């Protein structure tokens with residue numbers, strides 16, 4: 001909407017490229033630490049996203065073993081990073097918080 | 106104070122020479138076995 | 154197939170052969186087995202020293218001399234045992250640093266007993282360094298045991314009860330030798346429980362992401378890498394044994410213990426200097442002791458301070474910098490600990506001492522919260 | 531050509547083609563438990579022999 | 580098309596594990612003599628006339 | 641007890657005989673080399689010395 | 691973290707309170723008895739002696 005919230009994105013694009021998981025062809029949600037909430041969200045993914053997530057992670061563990069990265073052409077662009085897991089994950093948390101609010105009635 | 110001085114250096118020489126042999130040979134055995142993995146190629150072929 | 158059904162070889166199989174392991178664990182994962190090797194070396198060199206060592210003040214100094222001069226190849230056994238202990242502490246500190254950088258502490262059970270494995274090794278090497286009964290052995294033993302006198306009410310009773318007298322003397326050297334003999338076997342037992350809890354989950358890896366999609370068998374891939382690593386461990390040890398045996402040892406320990414005067418400046422072995430610095434950074438008795446205990450027991454509450462939605466620091470630049478400021482800060486405290494309580498080393502020792510606890514307790518927890526918000530989650 | 535074959539013949543012929551030779555492997559399906567190629571390759575000889 | 584030395588070593592020594600192990604133990608035996616022989620020869624050529632092996636001839640009687 | 645004496649078991653014996661006699665050469669040579677048994681090592685030409 | 695503050699959790703606290711204060715009496719009395727803590731054991735009448 002403005003120029004101030006636009007360099008805010010510029011420093012988030014900066015941190016994104018510095019974090020460097022896009023150099024392994026990975027997306028932000030591929031790097032989330034699996035807890036009980038996350039393991040449930042992954043369980044709920046449709047077959048296409050689950051299989052894609054499996055291969056991207058497998059491709060990255062392969063690269064990490066060789067201490068290599070993908071060509072710059074194949075890095076995950078900050079603009080094209082689909083937060084595919086947070087919708088499922090946010091509903092998992094929402095359900096858990098409901099149980100927790102009932103548990104103290 | 107150190108009567109073992111001369112003998113330890115003679116051993117030290119033998120230790121360096123054996124290491125100069127064994128380190129690259131053991132390194133070569135590691136690379137030999139691991140080469141199956143280091144040159145493996147992956148492909149993803151999902152149904153469409 | 155008998156390898157999978159014999160009740161004895163079953164447990165070996167599921168731990169060293171067919172155990173699934175990640176395909177991408179780096180050299181920082183080699184230090185687990187090097188700790189085991191270090192332990193085995195300290196058992197064997199230790200055992201063969203105990204066949205010629207005597208445990209009483211009159212001839213304790215002389216029996217070690219007797220080994221380095223008269224028994225066949227005992228001088229090499231003795232420096233292996235002395236430098237093996239220092240290699241043990243190198244591997245310990247890499248092992249822990251690996252766990253912090255890559256987030257392996259989330260294995261609570263494995264991690265929390267790992268802390269116990271750290272304390273017992275320190276207690277071992279402490280009671281090992283007393284046995285030759287040199288000057289550093291005696292007064293280093295005096296400073297440490299008096300830490301318990303700081304406990305209110307029951308302090309002095311525990312010290313004199315540990316001592317078996319009114320100061321470290323014949324009665325302490327005998328029991329310390331008994332403790333130094335038996336503790337490395339307790340360590341091996343707890344190291345087995347270390348692995349038992351570990352195998353419950355398997356190894357972490359440089360990325361912090363589950364490696365279930367891409368595992369390889371431990372054999373032949375990590376059996377050979379652990380061999381190669383061990384061969385570099387022998388190299389490190391033998392360079393110290395055969396070309397620089399007294400580099401880490403202090404000269405003062407080559408004069409028999411004298412209970413009447415101290416050296417003008419005492420310094421622990423390198424692997425305890427960072428913690429000695431924290432102790433001296435406080436002009437209070439009980440304060441210095443508590444700051445020393447929390448210096449190591451801080452590890453037990455690292456898992457409670459994890460704020461990042463990611464596990465490893467591989468994708469967290471802001472945590473990387475704070476991690477290396479801790480290594481430098483710890484390297485600073487090591488330097489102060491080796492220097493006399495004098496200006497400006499005193500004030501430096503206090504600033505580096507706050508920076509230690511400030512990083513772990515404040516800067517690194519909040520640094521993970523920032524980078525979560527930079528990544529919009 | 532068959533009656534010539536005895537036990538000595540199969541041992542000589544089999545060792546010529548099987549013993550300590552690099553195999554080709556092909557897998558399809560739920561093959562997570564398919565042994566790694568180095569393990570397969572080590573199954574092509576016996577340390578007792 | 581005579582097989583190189585590495586191929587003739589495999590066919591004769593290495594294919595069988597037993598012969599592969601026999602030549603390791605024999606290889607150790609002959610390697611030990613020539614290694615300690617040659618190694619000691621270097622250690623003293625560096626330190627020529629510095630230790631007792633060299634000045635033993637002065638104080639014979 | 642006497643399951644293992646018949647045509648096939650004497651064939652297995654004669655198949656593994658060349659191998660076991662070689663592992664006896666590994667052990668025997670390995671015992672000489674490890675213990676520095678001088679009674680044997682004098683007739684072999686090159687190692688004679690020291 | 692704050693899952694455990696609400697109507698039901700304060701009821702559980704008040705249910706197990708009488709028990710925990712008794713296990714503190716076991717431990718405290720057990721600590722006095724094992725270590726022979728004389729500062730406490732003087733006011734209790736009968737054990738006074740030796």
Ligand SMILES: CCCCCCCCCCCCCCCC(=O)OC[C@H](COP(=O)(O)OCCN)OC(=O)CCCCCCCCCCCCCCC
Nearest residue numbers: 115116117118119120121123124127194197198387391615
């Ligand atoms: C009951 C048995 C218990 C044994 C327990 C052992 C504990 C493990 C310690 C490992 C120390 C490494 C070698 C130091 C000795 C020395 O330096 O060797 C000195 C001798 C020279 O000696 P010399 O010239 O005096 O005589 C000469 C008479 N001919 O040659 C060497 O340089 C050999 C060392 C080469 C480099 C080391 C490579 C390590 C390989 C792994 C082997 C480990 C086997 C473990 C077996 C249990």
Ligand SMILES: CCCCCCCCCCCCCCCCCC(=O)OC[C@H](COP(=O)(O)OCCN)OC(=O)CCCCCCCCCCCCC
Nearest residue numbers: 067181246247249250251254359427466467480483484487
């Ligand atoms: C409590 C005891 C105090 C005693 C004082 C001891 C004195 C300290 C002396 C300092 C020696 C330092 C050793 C050299 C380290 C070099 C590391 C480096 O070269 O690479 C950085 C590496 C980054 O690599 P990534 O894993 O992110 O991804 C790789 C993509 N190709 O990232 C990593 O590799 C980092 C892994 C962890 C390193 C371990 C070192 C820390 C040692 C003490 C930690 C104690 C904390 C309580």
Ligand SMILES: CCCCCCCCCCCCCC(=O)OC[C@H](COP(=O)(O)OCC[N+](C)(C)C)OC(=O)CCCCCCCCCCCCC
Nearest residue numbers: 380383384550575593594595596599600603604670671674
């Ligand atoms: C009473 C006195 C008795 C004395 C007896 C003396 C006997 C000496 C040993 C001889 C035994 C040889 C057996 C043998 O080589 O097989 C073991 C494996 C097989 O190697 P590999 O190349 O996999 O397969 C060979 C297949 N073949 C035979 C058909 C060509 O070979 C290897 O893979 C071994 C290579 C690695 C060795 C290092 C292991 C030691 C532990 C780590 C050391 C450093 C830190 C402690």
Ligand code: HEM
Nearest residue numbers: 182184185186188189252257264267268270271344356357
């Ligand atoms: C005598 C002491 C110890 C021994 C023998 C030992 C051995 C091992 C071994 C063999 C592994 C698995 C292989 C590896 O990751 O290298 C391991 C993993 C681990 N250890 Fe230790 N260790 C010891 C002390 C410690 C200490 C002091 C800590 C932490 C304060 C610790 C925490 C851990 C953790 C968290 C792991 C899991 C690492 C991972 O899989 O990513 N251990 N240890």
Ligand code: HEM
Nearest residue numbers: 195196199200202203206231235238278281282284285337
């Ligand atoms: C993790 C295990 C061990 C560590 C870190 C360790 C460490 C040490 C250290 C640092 C010393 C001082 C050496 C010196 O200043 O000269 C020492 C001495 C000694 N250790 Fe150990 N030790 C271990 C296990 C053992 C075991 C299992 C035994 C016996 C069964 C043993 C027997 C001795 C003896 C007799 C001495 C006195 C001789 C000497 O000073 O060299 N050690 N130990």
Ligand SMILES: CCCCCC(=O)OC[C@H](COP(=O)([O-])OCCN)OC(=O)CCCCC
Nearest residue numbers: 372373376377380568571572573574575576577
């Ligand atoms: C005294 C001799 C002991 C022999 C040990 C042995 O050979 O173990 C198996 C492997 C090689 O055999 P393989 O894995 O090819 O399997 C062959 C299947 N036919 O070797 C190693 O890599 C193990 C390392 C042991 C270190 C302690």
Ligand SMILES: CCCCCC(=O)OC[C@H](COP(=O)([O-])OCCN)OC(=O)CCCCC
Nearest residue numbers: 670671672673674675676677678679680681682
């Ligand atoms: C079972 C452990 C064997 C321990 C033997 C020992 O310590 O070494 C002594 C002899 C030395 O050979 P020799 O020619 O001097 O002969 C000296 C004669 N006394 O070596 C031998 O003779 C090896 C014999 C092995 C048989 C099992």
Ligand SMILES: CCCCCC(=O)OC[C@H](COP(=O)([O-])OCCN)OC(=O)CCCCC
Nearest residue numbers: 306307310311314721722725726727728729730
């Ligand atoms: C944790 C191990 C405790 C070891 C205490 C000990 O050895 O006994 C000493 C005193 C004796 O009581 P006191 O009235 O003589 O008093 C003497 C005062 N110095 O007993 C106590 O005071 C018990 C205190 C326990 C607190 C944890």
Ligand SMILES: CSC1=N[C@@](C)(c2ccccc2)C(=O)N1Nc1ccccc1
Nearest residue numbers: 275278279282290293294296420421422
């Ligand atoms: C018992 S003398 C001693 N034991 C060591 C090896 C040790 C102490 C504590 C924990 C583990 C190992 C050490 O550094 N010192 N020296 C020393 C010098 C001054 C003050 C304290 C110790």
Ligand SMILES: [Cl-]
Nearest residue numbers: 217218285407
């Ligand atoms: Cl001494």
